Amino acid sequence: DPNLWTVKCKIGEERATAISLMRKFIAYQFTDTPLQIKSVVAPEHVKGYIYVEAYKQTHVKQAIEGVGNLRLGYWNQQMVPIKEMTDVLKVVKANLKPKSWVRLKRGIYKDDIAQVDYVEPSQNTISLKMIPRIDYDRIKA
Amino acid sequence: ALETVPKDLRHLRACLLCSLVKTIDQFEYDGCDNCDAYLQMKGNREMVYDCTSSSFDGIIAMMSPEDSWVSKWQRVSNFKPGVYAVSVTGRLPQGIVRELKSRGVAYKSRDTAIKT
Ligand SMILES: [Zn+2]
Numbered sequence: 001d002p003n004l005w006t007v008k009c010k011i012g013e014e015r016a017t018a019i020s021l022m023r024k025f026i027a028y029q030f031t032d033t034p035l036q037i038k039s040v041v042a043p044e045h046v047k048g049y050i051y052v053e054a055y056k057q058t059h060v061k062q063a064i065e066g067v068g069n070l071r072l073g074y075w076n077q078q079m080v081p082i083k084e085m086t087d088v089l090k091v092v093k094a095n096l097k098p099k100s101w102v103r104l105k106r107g108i109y110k111d112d113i114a115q116v117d118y119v120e121p122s123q124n125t126i127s128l129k130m131i132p133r134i135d136y137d138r139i140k141a
Numbered sequence: 142a143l144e145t146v147p148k149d150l151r152h153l154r155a156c157l158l159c160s161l162v163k164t165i166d167q168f169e170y171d172g173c174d175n176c177d178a179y180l181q182m183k184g185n186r187e188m189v190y191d192c193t194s195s196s197f198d199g200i201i202a203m204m205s206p207e208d209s210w211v212s213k214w215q216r217v218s219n220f221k222p223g224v225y226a227v228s229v230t231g232r233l234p235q236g237i238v239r240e241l242k243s244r245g246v247a248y249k250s251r252d253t254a255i256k257t
Contacts, residue, residue, distance in 0.1 A: 001210050015150060015200065022146055022202045022224065038209040040202045053209060085210060089199070091228045091254035096196040121190055123152060 002038050004085055005060045008049045008073020017050055017069050018042045035063045041088055051088060145174055145223035155197035155226040157233060160251050162200060162224040168193055175220045179246050199227035228254035
């Protein structure tokens with residue numbers, strides 16, 4: 001059973017980190033310097049450090065050498081105990097389902113609980129059900 | 142290979158059979174690399190938007206499914222190494238699951254995420 005290591009990354013650059021290390025692996029699997037990594041875990045609920053799969057601590061050091069996104073947490077590679085290989089894959093309740101209850105972030109109905117009606121397949125806009133709280137143009141000028 | 146890596150981070154989805162995480166251009170030009178004779182999602186956009194959805198989370202760089210602890214837990218060890226997901230929510234309609242049982246493909250719920 002392979003071990004899991006924790007490396008430090010830039011905040012905001014998790015998916016770019018994963019999509020860059022995957023292309024390094026594919027860019028070096030056929031040379032004289034391959035990569036000994038199995039996978040790299042990047043949860044969407046975290047922000048700041050990622051997870052990597054390797055048997056020994058020298059493999060992560062000889063695999064992440066040369067990347068500028070992982071140059072900060074390069075001098076230290078923490079190790080998790082074996083019971084933490086499972087809590088990493090757990091996701092608590094994507095988040096796109098009709099007839100559900102979402103809230104707003106910007107606009108006038110901030111932090112107001114609404115409902116979804118229809119979803120646009122273009123992934124551009126979404127239908128919402130809220131209640132207007134305007135004055136019907138009586139108080140404002 | 143170079144085809145299973147999504148080129149752009151915008152408009153990417155994940156399937157409900159092998160949790161294949163790619164961009165919307167590769168599911169239409171090439172499709173599901175882990176199932177092409179049972180799904181046939183290359184050559185159109187209705188079948189790509191029908192089975193494969195965007196409601197998914199969690200990203201893993203599967204490289205050696207024959208030797209890794211995560212690949213056996215997600216039952217993705219008999220698949221091609223590449224971009225996969227760990228919780229792909231949703232369900233197939235009662236229009237493509239009936240043909241999968243008669244052909245010998247047991248459609249499993251890949252959603253390992255807990256509900257409340
Ligand atoms: Zn699939």
